[PDB]
Coordinates of C-alpha atoms in Angstrom, one line a residue:
Chain J
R307 CA -24.6 70.1 16.0
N308 CA -26.4 71.0 19.2
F309 CA -29.4 73.3 19.0
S310 CA -31.3 74.7 22.0
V311 CA -35.1 74.4 21.5
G312 CA -37.5 76.7 23.2
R313 CA -41.2 76.3 23.9
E314 CA -42.2 78.7 21.1
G315 CA -40.4 76.3 18.8
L316 CA -37.6 75.9 16.3
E317 CA -37.2 75.3 12.6
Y318 CA -34.2 73.8 10.8
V319 CA -33.6 73.5 7.1
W320 CA -31.1 70.9 6.0
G321 CA -30.0 71.0 2.4
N322 CA -32.8 71.2 -0.1
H323 CA -35.3 69.4 2.0
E324 CA -38.4 71.2 3.0
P325 CA -38.4 72.9 6.4
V326 CA -39.0 70.7 9.5
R327 CA -40.6 72.3 12.6
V328 CA -40.2 70.9 16.1
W329 CA -41.5 72.2 19.4
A330 CA -40.1 71.6 22.9
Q331 CA -42.0 70.0 25.8
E332 CA -41.9 70.4 29.6
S333 CA -40.3 67.0 30.3
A334 CA -38.0 68.1 33.1
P335 CA -36.4 65.4 35.3
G336 CA -38.0 65.0 38.7
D337 CA -41.6 64.8 39.8
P338 CA -44.1 67.8 40.2
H339 CA -46.1 65.8 42.7
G340 CA -43.6 63.9 44.8
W341 CA -41.6 65.1 47.8
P342 CA -40.4 68.7 47.7
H343 CA -37.0 67.1 47.0
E344 CA -38.5 66.1 43.7
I345 CA -40.4 69.4 43.3
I346 CA -37.3 71.6 43.5
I347 CA -35.3 69.5 41.0
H348 CA -38.2 69.4 38.6
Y349 CA -38.9 73.2 38.7
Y350 CA -35.2 74.2 38.7
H351 CA -34.7 73.0 35.1
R352 CA -37.9 74.6 33.8
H353 CA -37.3 78.0 35.4
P354 CA -34.1 78.3 37.5
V355 CA -34.5 82.1 37.9
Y356 CA -38.0 82.0 39.2
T357 CA -37.4 78.9 41.3
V358 CA -34.4 80.4 43.1
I359 CA -36.3 83.7 43.6
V360 CA -39.3 81.9 45.2
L361 CA -37.1 79.7 47.4
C362 CA -35.2 82.8 48.6
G363 CA -38.5 84.6 49.2
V364 CA -39.8 81.7 51.4
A365 CA -36.5 81.5 53.3
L366 CA -36.5 85.2 54.1
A367 CA -40.1 85.1 55.1
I368 CA -39.4 82.3 57.5
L369 CA -36.5 84.3 59.0
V370 CA -38.7 87.4 59.3
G371 CA -41.5 85.5 61.0
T372 CA -39.1 83.9 63.5
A373 CA -37.4 87.2 64.2
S374 CA -40.8 88.8 64.8
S375 CA -41.7 86.0 67.2
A376 CA -38.8 87.0 69.5
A377 CA -39.4 90.7 68.9
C378 CA -42.9 90.3 70.2
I379 CA -42.6 87.5 72.8
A380 CA -39.5 88.9 74.5
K381 CA -41.0 92.4 74.8
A382 CA -44.3 91.1 76.1
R383 CA -42.4 88.9 78.6
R384 CA -40.4 91.9 79.6
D385 CA -43.4 94.2 80.3
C386 CA -45.2 91.3 82.0
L387 CA -42.4 90.5 84.4
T388 CA -40.7 93.8 85.1
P389 CA -43.7 95.1 87.2
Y390 CA -43.4 91.9 89.2
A391 CA -39.6 91.8 89.1
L392 CA -39.4 94.6 91.7
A393 CA -42.0 93.3 94.2
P394 CA -42.1 90.7 97.0
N395 CA -43.5 87.2 96.5
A396 CA -44.3 87.6 92.8
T397 CA -47.4 85.4 92.8
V398 CA -47.6 85.3 89.0
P399 CA -49.5 82.3 87.6
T400 CA -46.7 79.8 87.5
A401 CA -47.4 78.9 83.9
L402 CA -46.7 82.5 82.9
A403 CA -43.4 82.5 84.7
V404 CA -42.3 79.2 83.3
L405 CA -43.3 80.2 79.7
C406 CA -41.6 83.6 80.1
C407 CA -38.3 82.1 81.5
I408 CA -37.4 80.2 78.3
Chain V
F1 CA -76.4 88.0 18.6
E2 CA -73.0 89.7 18.9
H3 CA -70.1 88.2 20.8
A4 CA -66.6 89.5 21.6
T5 CA -63.5 87.5 22.2
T6 CA -59.7 87.6 21.8
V7 CA -58.3 84.8 19.7
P8 CA -54.6 83.9 19.8
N9 CA -53.1 84.4 16.3
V10 CA -51.5 81.0 15.9
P11 CA -52.4 79.4 12.6
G12 CA -53.3 75.7 12.9
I13 CA -54.8 75.7 16.4
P14 CA -58.5 75.8 17.1
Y15 CA -59.8 78.1 19.8
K16 CA -63.0 77.1 21.5
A17 CA -65.4 79.3 23.4
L18 CA -69.0 78.9 24.8
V19 CA -71.7 81.5 24.3
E20 CA -74.3 81.3 27.1
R21 CA -77.3 83.4 25.9
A22 CA -79.6 83.6 28.9
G23 CA -82.9 82.8 27.0
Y24 CA -81.4 80.1 24.7
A25 CA -79.4 77.0 25.3
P26 CA -75.6 77.2 25.4
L27 CA -73.8 77.0 22.1
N28 CA -70.3 76.0 21.2
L29 CA -67.9 78.3 19.3
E30 CA -64.6 77.0 18.0
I31 CA -62.4 79.4 16.0
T32 CA -59.4 78.6 13.8
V33 CA -57.1 80.9 11.9
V34 CA -56.5 79.0 8.7
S35 CA -54.1 81.5 7.2
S36 CA -52.7 85.0 7.6
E37 CA -51.1 87.4 5.2
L38 CA -49.3 90.4 6.6
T39 CA -48.7 92.7 3.6
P40 CA -47.1 96.2 3.8
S41 CA -47.3 99.2 1.5
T42 CA -44.2 99.7 -0.6
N43 CA -42.7 102.1 -3.1
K44 CA -39.9 101.1 -5.6
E45 CA -36.8 103.4 -5.2
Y46 CA -34.6 101.8 -7.9
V47 CA -33.2 98.7 -9.5
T48 CA -29.5 97.8 -9.7
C49 CA -27.3 95.0 -11.2
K50 CA -23.8 94.5 -12.9
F51 CA -22.8 97.5 -14.9
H52 CA -21.3 97.0 -18.4
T53 CA -18.5 99.5 -18.8
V54 CA -19.0 100.5 -22.4
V55 CA -16.2 102.3 -24.1
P56 CA -17.0 104.2 -27.3
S57 CA -14.5 104.0 -30.1
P58 CA -12.0 106.8 -29.6
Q59 CA -11.6 109.8 -31.9
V60 CA -8.4 111.7 -32.6
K61 CA -8.0 115.2 -33.8
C62 CA -5.0 114.4 -35.9
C63 CA -3.1 117.7 -35.7
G64 CA -5.4 119.9 -33.7
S65 CA -7.2 119.9 -30.3
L66 CA -10.3 118.4 -28.7
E67 CA -12.4 119.5 -25.7
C68 CA -14.3 117.3 -23.3
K69 CA -18.1 117.7 -23.8
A70 CA -20.7 117.5 -21.1
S71 CA -22.9 114.5 -21.8
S72 CA -25.6 112.9 -19.6
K73 CA -24.5 109.4 -19.6
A74 CA -24.2 107.4 -16.3
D75 CA -20.9 108.3 -14.6
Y76 CA -19.8 109.9 -17.8
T77 CA -16.0 110.3 -18.0
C78 CA -14.0 112.0 -20.8
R79 CA -10.3 113.0 -20.9
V80 CA -8.0 114.5 -23.6
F81 CA -4.4 113.5 -24.0
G82 CA -1.6 115.2 -25.9
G83 CA 0.5 113.8 -28.7
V84 CA 0.2 110.0 -29.1
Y85 CA 1.0 109.3 -32.7
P86 CA -1.0 106.1 -32.8
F87 CA -0.3 103.1 -35.0
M88 CA -2.6 100.3 -36.3
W89 CA -2.3 97.1 -38.3
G90 CA -2.5 99.4 -41.3
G91 CA 0.3 101.5 -39.8
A92 CA 0.6 105.0 -38.6
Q93 CA -2.6 106.9 -38.1
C94 CA -1.5 110.6 -38.1
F95 CA 1.0 113.0 -39.5
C96 CA 2.0 115.1 -36.5
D97 CA 4.3 113.5 -34.0
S98 CA 3.2 116.2 -31.5
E99 CA -0.1 118.1 -31.0
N100 CA -1.8 114.8 -32.1
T101 CA -4.4 114.8 -29.3
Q102 CA -6.8 111.9 -28.5
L103 CA -10.2 112.0 -26.7
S104 CA -10.9 109.1 -24.3
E105 CA -14.5 108.4 -23.6
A106 CA -16.3 105.9 -21.3
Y107 CA -19.6 105.4 -19.5
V108 CA -21.8 102.6 -18.3
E109 CA -25.1 100.9 -19.1
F110 CA -26.9 97.9 -17.8
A111 CA -25.4 94.6 -18.7
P112 CA -27.5 92.5 -21.1
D113 CA -28.0 89.8 -18.4
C114 CA -29.4 92.4 -15.9
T115 CA -33.0 91.6 -17.3
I116 CA -33.0 88.5 -15.0
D117 CA -30.0 89.3 -12.7
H118 CA -31.2 92.6 -11.0
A119 CA -32.2 93.8 -7.5
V120 CA -35.1 96.1 -6.5
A121 CA -34.9 98.5 -3.5
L122 CA -38.1 99.1 -1.7
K123 CA -39.2 101.0 1.4
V124 CA -41.9 99.6 3.7
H125 CA -44.5 101.3 5.9
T126 CA -47.0 100.1 8.4
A127 CA -48.3 96.7 7.4
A128 CA -52.0 95.8 7.4
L129 CA -52.6 92.2 8.6
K130 CA -55.2 90.2 6.7
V131 CA -56.5 86.8 7.9
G132 CA -58.5 84.0 6.6
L133 CA -60.7 82.4 9.3
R134 CA -62.6 79.2 9.5
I135 CA -65.1 79.6 12.3
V136 CA -67.7 77.1 13.3
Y137 CA -70.8 77.6 15.5
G138 CA -73.1 74.6 16.2
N139 CA -73.3 73.1 12.7
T140 CA -72.4 76.0 10.5
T141 CA -68.8 76.3 9.4
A142 CA -68.5 79.2 7.0
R143 CA -65.2 80.9 6.3
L144 CA -64.2 84.4 5.5
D145 CA -61.2 86.7 4.7
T146 CA -61.0 89.9 6.8
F147 CA -58.7 92.8 7.6
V148 CA -57.5 92.9 11.2
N149 CA -57.7 96.6 12.0
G150 CA -60.7 96.9 14.4
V151 CA -62.8 98.8 11.8
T152 CA -63.3 96.9 8.6
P153 CA -65.9 94.2 9.0
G154 CA -65.5 90.8 7.4
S155 CA -69.1 90.2 6.1
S156 CA -69.8 86.6 5.2
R157 CA -73.0 84.8 4.0
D158 CA -74.7 86.2 7.1
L159 CA -72.1 85.8 9.7
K160 CA -70.8 89.3 10.5
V161 CA -67.5 89.8 12.2
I162 CA -65.1 92.5 13.0
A163 CA -61.5 91.7 14.1
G164 CA -58.6 93.6 15.6
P165 CA -56.7 95.8 16.0
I166 CA -53.7 93.5 16.5
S167 CA -52.6 93.4 20.1
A168 CA -49.0 94.4 19.3
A169 CA -48.1 95.7 15.8
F170 CA -45.1 94.1 14.3
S171 CA -43.3 94.0 11.0
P172 CA -40.6 91.6 9.9
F173 CA -39.4 94.1 7.3
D174 CA -36.9 96.8 8.5
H175 CA -37.4 100.2 7.0
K176 CA -35.3 99.5 3.8
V177 CA -35.6 96.2 1.9
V178 CA -34.0 94.6 -1.2
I179 CA -35.7 91.7 -3.2
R180 CA -33.5 89.7 -5.6
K181 CA -34.7 86.5 -7.4
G182 CA -37.4 85.7 -4.7
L183 CA -34.9 86.2 -1.9
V184 CA -35.5 89.1 0.5
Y185 CA -32.8 91.0 2.4
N186 CA -32.9 93.8 5.0
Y187 CA -30.0 95.9 3.8
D188 CA -29.8 99.7 4.4
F189 CA -29.0 100.5 0.8
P190 CA -27.9 104.0 0.0
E191 CA -30.5 106.4 -1.2
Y192 CA -31.3 107.2 -4.8
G193 CA -28.6 109.4 -6.3
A194 CA -26.1 108.8 -3.5
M195 CA -24.1 106.2 -5.3
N196 CA -20.8 105.2 -3.7
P197 CA -18.5 103.1 -5.8
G198 CA -17.6 99.6 -4.7
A199 CA -20.7 99.2 -2.6
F200 CA -24.3 98.1 -3.2
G201 CA -26.3 100.3 -5.5
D202 CA -23.4 101.8 -7.2
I203 CA -25.6 102.0 -10.4
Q204 CA -29.2 102.9 -10.1
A205 CA -32.2 103.6 -12.4
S206 CA -35.9 103.9 -12.1
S207 CA -36.5 101.0 -14.5
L208 CA -34.6 98.6 -16.7
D209 CA -35.6 100.5 -19.8
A210 CA -35.3 103.9 -18.2
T211 CA -32.7 106.1 -20.0
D212 CA -31.8 108.4 -17.1
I213 CA -29.5 105.9 -15.5
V214 CA -27.1 107.4 -12.9
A215 CA -24.0 105.7 -11.5
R216 CA -20.7 106.7 -9.9
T217 CA -18.1 103.9 -10.4
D218 CA -14.9 106.0 -10.0
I219 CA -13.9 105.2 -13.5
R220 CA -10.6 107.0 -14.5
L221 CA -8.7 107.1 -17.8
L222 CA -4.9 106.9 -18.1
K223 CA -2.4 108.1 -20.6
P224 CA -2.0 105.6 -23.4
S225 CA 1.7 104.5 -23.2
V226 CA 1.8 101.8 -25.9
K227 CA 1.8 103.1 -29.4
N228 CA -1.0 100.8 -30.6
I229 CA -4.3 102.6 -30.3
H230 CA -6.2 101.5 -27.2
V231 CA -7.9 103.3 -24.3
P232 CA -6.8 102.1 -20.8
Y233 CA -9.0 102.6 -17.8
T234 CA -9.2 101.3 -14.2
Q235 CA -12.5 101.1 -12.3
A236 CA -13.7 99.8 -9.0
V237 CA -15.2 96.4 -8.9
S238 CA -19.0 96.0 -9.3
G239 CA -20.4 96.7 -5.8
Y240 CA -23.5 94.7 -6.9
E241 CA -21.3 91.5 -7.0
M242 CA -19.6 92.5 -3.7
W243 CA -23.0 92.6 -2.0
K244 CA -24.0 89.3 -3.8
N245 CA -21.0 87.6 -2.1
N246 CA -21.4 89.3 1.3
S247 CA -25.2 89.2 1.2
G248 CA -25.6 87.1 4.3
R249 CA -28.6 84.8 4.6
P250 CA -31.9 85.8 3.1
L251 CA -35.0 86.7 5.2
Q252 CA -36.6 83.3 4.5
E253 CA -34.1 82.0 7.1
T254 CA -34.0 85.0 9.4
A255 CA -37.5 86.4 9.8
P256 CA -38.6 85.8 13.4
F257 CA -41.9 84.3 14.6
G258 CA -41.5 81.4 12.1
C259 CA -42.8 83.6 9.3
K260 CA -42.8 82.3 5.7
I261 CA -41.9 85.2 3.4
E262 CA -43.1 85.4 -0.2
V263 CA -42.8 88.0 -3.0
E264 CA -44.8 89.5 -5.8
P265 CA -46.2 91.4 -3.9
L266 CA -44.0 91.5 -0.8
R267 CA -45.9 89.7 2.0
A268 CA -45.5 87.7 5.2
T269 CA -47.8 84.7 5.6
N270 CA -48.7 82.5 8.6
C271 CA -47.1 84.8 11.1
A272 CA -47.8 83.8 14.7
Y273 CA -47.6 86.6 17.2
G274 CA -50.0 88.6 19.4
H275 CA -53.7 88.3 20.0
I276 CA -56.5 89.2 17.6
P277 CA -59.7 90.7 19.2
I278 CA -62.7 89.3 17.3
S279 CA -66.2 90.6 17.7
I280 CA -68.7 88.4 15.9
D281 CA -72.5 88.7 15.4
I282 CA -73.7 85.0 15.3
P283 CA -77.3 85.0 13.9
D284 CA -80.1 83.8 16.2
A285 CA -81.3 81.3 13.6
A286 CA -78.6 78.9 14.7
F287 CA -79.5 79.4 18.3
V288 CA -81.9 76.9 19.8
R289 CA -83.9 77.6 23.0
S290 CA -83.4 75.5 26.1
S291 CA -87.0 74.4 26.1
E292 CA -86.2 72.2 23.1
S293 CA -82.6 71.4 23.9
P294 CA -82.0 68.6 26.5
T295 CA -81.1 70.0 29.9
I296 CA -79.2 67.3 31.7
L297 CA -80.1 66.5 35.3
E298 CA -76.9 65.2 36.9
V299 CA -73.3 64.8 35.5
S300 CA -70.1 64.0 37.3
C301 CA -66.5 63.9 36.2
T302 CA -64.0 61.0 36.5
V303 CA -60.6 61.7 35.0
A304 CA -58.2 59.0 33.8
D305 CA -54.5 59.4 33.5
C306 CA -53.5 62.8 32.1
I307 CA -50.3 64.4 30.9
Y308 CA -49.5 68.0 30.1
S309 CA -48.2 68.2 26.5
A310 CA -49.0 69.8 23.2
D311 CA -50.7 66.7 22.1
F312 CA -54.1 65.5 23.5
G313 CA -52.5 63.5 26.3
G314 CA -55.5 63.5 28.6
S315 CA -58.7 61.5 29.0
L316 CA -61.7 61.6 31.3
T317 CA -65.2 60.1 31.6
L318 CA -68.6 61.8 32.2
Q319 CA -71.4 59.9 33.7
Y320 CA -74.5 61.9 32.8
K321 CA -78.3 61.8 33.4
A322 CA -80.5 63.8 31.0
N323 CA -84.0 64.1 29.8
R324 CA -83.8 63.7 26.0
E325 CA -81.7 62.4 23.2
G326 CA -79.8 65.3 21.6
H327 CA -76.6 67.1 20.6
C328 CA -75.5 68.9 23.8
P329 CA -72.3 71.0 23.4
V330 CA -69.4 70.2 25.7
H331 CA -66.8 72.8 26.6
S332 CA -64.0 73.6 29.0
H333 CA -64.4 76.7 31.1
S334 CA -60.6 77.1 31.7
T335 CA -57.8 78.7 29.8
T336 CA -55.4 75.9 30.6
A337 CA -57.4 72.9 29.2
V338 CA -59.1 72.3 25.9
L339 CA -61.2 69.4 24.8
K340 CA -61.1 67.7 21.4
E341 CA -64.8 67.0 20.8
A342 CA -67.4 69.7 20.8
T343 CA -70.8 68.1 20.4
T344 CA -71.6 64.6 21.7
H345 CA -74.9 62.8 21.1
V346 CA -76.5 62.7 24.5
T347 CA -79.0 60.1 25.6
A348 CA -81.4 60.0 28.6
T349 CA -78.7 58.3 30.7
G350 CA -75.2 57.0 29.9
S351 CA -71.6 58.0 29.7
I352 CA -69.2 59.8 27.4
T353 CA -65.5 59.5 27.2
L354 CA -63.6 62.6 26.0
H355 CA -60.0 63.6 25.2
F356 CA -58.3 66.8 26.3
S357 CA -55.0 68.6 26.4
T358 CA -53.7 70.7 29.3
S359 CA -50.7 72.7 30.1
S360 CA -51.0 72.6 33.8
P361 CA -49.4 69.9 36.0
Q362 CA -52.9 69.3 37.6
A363 CA -56.2 69.3 35.8
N364 CA -58.2 71.4 38.3
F365 CA -60.7 72.7 35.8
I366 CA -64.4 73.1 35.3
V367 CA -66.1 71.2 32.6
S368 CA -69.6 72.4 31.5
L369 CA -72.2 70.2 29.8
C370 CA -75.2 72.0 28.4
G371 CA -74.7 74.6 31.1
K372 CA -74.2 72.1 34.0
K373 CA -70.9 72.6 35.7
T374 CA -68.7 70.0 37.4
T375 CA -65.2 70.3 38.8
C376 CA -62.7 67.7 37.5
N377 CA -59.8 67.1 39.9
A378 CA -56.8 65.3 38.4
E379 CA -53.0 65.1 38.5
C380 CA -51.2 65.1 35.2
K381 CA -47.7 63.6 34.9
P382 CA -44.8 65.2 33.0
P383 CA -44.6 64.1 29.4
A384 CA -42.4 61.1 28.5
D385 CA -41.2 62.6 25.2
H386 CA -39.0 65.6 24.8
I387 CA -40.0 66.9 21.3
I388 CA -43.2 67.0 19.3
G389 CA -44.2 67.8 15.8
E390 CA -47.1 69.8 17.0
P391 CA -47.3 73.3 18.4
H392 CA -48.6 73.8 21.9
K393 CA -52.3 74.4 21.6
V394 CA -52.6 76.2 24.9
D395 CA -50.7 78.9 26.6
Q396 CA -48.9 78.2 29.9
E397 CA -50.0 80.6 32.7
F398 CA -48.5 81.1 36.1
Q399 CA -51.5 80.5 38.5
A400 CA -52.5 77.1 37.2
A401 CA -48.9 76.1 36.5
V402 CA -47.7 74.7 39.9
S403 CA -49.0 71.6 41.4
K404 CA -51.2 71.6 44.4
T405 CA -48.5 69.7 46.3
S406 CA -46.1 72.6 45.7
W407 CA -49.0 75.1 46.3
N408 CA -49.8 73.5 49.6
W409 CA -46.2 73.5 50.7
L410 CA -45.8 77.2 49.7
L411 CA -49.0 78.3 51.3
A412 CA -48.1 76.5 54.5
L413 CA -44.7 78.0 54.6
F414 CA -46.1 81.5 54.0
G415 CA -49.1 81.1 56.3
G416 CA -46.8 80.1 59.1
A417 CA -45.0 83.4 59.0
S418 CA -48.3 85.3 58.5
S419 CA -50.0 83.7 61.4
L420 CA -46.8 84.1 63.5
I421 CA -46.6 87.9 62.9
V422 CA -50.4 88.2 63.5
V423 CA -50.1 86.3 66.8
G424 CA -47.2 88.4 67.8
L425 CA -49.1 91.6 67.2
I426 CA -52.2 90.2 69.1
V427 CA -50.0 89.1 72.0
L428 CA -48.5 92.6 72.3
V429 CA -51.9 94.2 72.2
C430 CA -53.3 91.7 74.8
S431 CA -50.3 92.3 77.1
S432 CA -50.9 96.1 76.9
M433 CA -54.6 95.6 77.8
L434 CA -53.8 93.3 80.7
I435 CA -51.3 95.7 82.1
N436 CA -53.8 98.6 81.8
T437 CA -56.7 96.6 83.4
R438 CA -54.8 95.3 86.4
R439 CA -52.8 98.6 86.9
Chain I
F1 CA -43.1 55.0 22.9
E2 CA -40.2 53.8 25.0
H3 CA -41.0 51.6 28.0
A4 CA -38.4 50.5 30.5
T5 CA -38.7 47.3 32.7
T6 CA -36.5 45.0 34.7
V7 CA -37.3 41.5 33.6
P8 CA -36.1 38.7 35.9
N9 CA -33.7 36.4 34.1
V10 CA -35.6 33.2 34.6
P11 CA -36.1 31.0 31.5
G12 CA -39.6 29.9 30.7
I13 CA -41.4 32.3 33.1
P14 CA -43.3 35.0 31.3
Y15 CA -43.1 38.5 32.9
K16 CA -46.1 40.8 32.4
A17 CA -46.3 44.6 32.6
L18 CA -48.7 47.3 31.6
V19 CA -47.7 50.2 29.4
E20 CA -49.8 53.4 30.0
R21 CA -49.5 56.1 27.4
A22 CA -51.5 59.0 28.6
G23 CA -53.9 59.6 25.8
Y24 CA -54.3 55.9 24.9
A25 CA -55.9 52.8 26.3
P26 CA -53.5 50.7 28.3
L27 CA -51.8 47.8 26.5
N28 CA -50.6 44.5 27.9
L29 CA -47.0 43.5 27.6
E30 CA -45.8 39.9 28.1
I31 CA -42.1 39.3 28.0
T32 CA -40.7 35.7 28.0
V33 CA -37.0 34.8 28.0
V34 CA -37.1 31.8 25.6
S35 CA -33.3 31.2 25.6
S36 CA -30.1 32.6 26.9
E37 CA -26.5 31.6 26.3
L38 CA -23.6 33.1 28.1
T39 CA -20.3 32.7 26.1
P40 CA -16.9 33.7 27.4
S41 CA -13.9 35.0 25.4
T42 CA -11.8 31.9 24.8
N43 CA -8.4 31.2 23.3
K44 CA -6.6 27.9 22.8
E45 CA -3.3 27.7 24.6
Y46 CA -2.5 24.1 23.6
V47 CA -3.8 20.5 23.3
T48 CA -2.6 17.3 24.9
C49 CA -3.0 13.6 24.9

């Protein structure tokens, strides 16, 4: 018989023996201090729900940050080039033009 | 001196705390719940068992008529039949082939074996939780029984304590309960007087000797067809037995929270759930002022291998420098690590090795020695076992439950986005200011 | 307490390792392969002279 054991614990009574109580541990496979490759596998077994939620949160936050980067940079580049885009001999600092052209 | 705390209600686990009275030296306080007894208030509705269908010896009005009386037996049932002309071993019994009526009578009483084989129906109300505590401060270690309600004080020899109310009221008993031969069941038995045949509690009475027994077993009498005198009857099976077969498992195997149920009176012992607020007035006589206690000069922490498990799977070493030989109290000022030892004989200079258990993957916790604080930094591995015969002595939180490697990775990944959005906003503002200035 | 090692199969050479249970002092473990015989599955087909 297979019995799932939680951290709060479990009790089984077999025949007329007295009850035996056993408690689970946190011995998930992986390492909590190794590379993140070990981190994720270790924490997925302890709490797959939370682990997936946090990983998604981070992934989204990264995508937000990167999208913001363009949303700001491109607009600033736009407003910093368009006044000079309709002028002769746009003597902008060449570093600004190079940075803004990419 | 009065102190307030909130002790986890988990029998068999010491809880340690430190009281730092400003004038005096620090004192240790370890609290253990030796036993608990959650007992409700109950009233007995009735008792039930196997009915004995008693059938009085029939009477015949030989050439006349009979009428059914109105008795007060349990499920009393009487009928009258027409001409029967009965015969016995002696022979015929009457002289009228017709108009030779018979009166059939039957009722029930308790079976003679019900004295031991019977079930009691009870209702329960809000249950008051009583606890026995062993509490130690410094050297003293008196015990005491108290009621956990937040009002009633558990006065001891001199140690005065108030406890409770319980953090979350709970009762393993549903509203209706049945207790049979030690075993307890949660069955919604039908109310007193509402007997339904063929189901539990088809016969009820206030007590085994009570004479006002009431039952409804659907007993019905039939016409006697054979010419030998006999009274036939058919009746539903004893619902008591039906229940006994379909009882299900008793509450000793079904109460949650690992609670060990016992009877006479109904109660629930060693029930681990919730938190108990405890306020305790420790007397100042046990307190010792810091002018007499050794105040240590310099202590540092070196932690050996540690592992996060219910057992004491961690060790560390303290190199200390003090000013006297004494009995300094050691303590952990974190909720996710607890030491084993409390008081260590301290010398002028030397070292002490201690054991501890933690729930966190990293030991990142402050140890205090006679008030002096030092931060231990460690890194506990996952436990090698999978199962233990001990309960986890410390709760697992969220904050100190992820390693600093994971924490560093997470904080880096979030701080990147945070700094990026901040830089983007700053860049937009700066571009606007530059356009305005050189406009 | 279960400890896993990979002892080199070399007769007469002790192999030493350290077992480290977390709450306990380390213990020394010396493993020596005193003897080893490899025996195949064999079945007589015939004899001759």
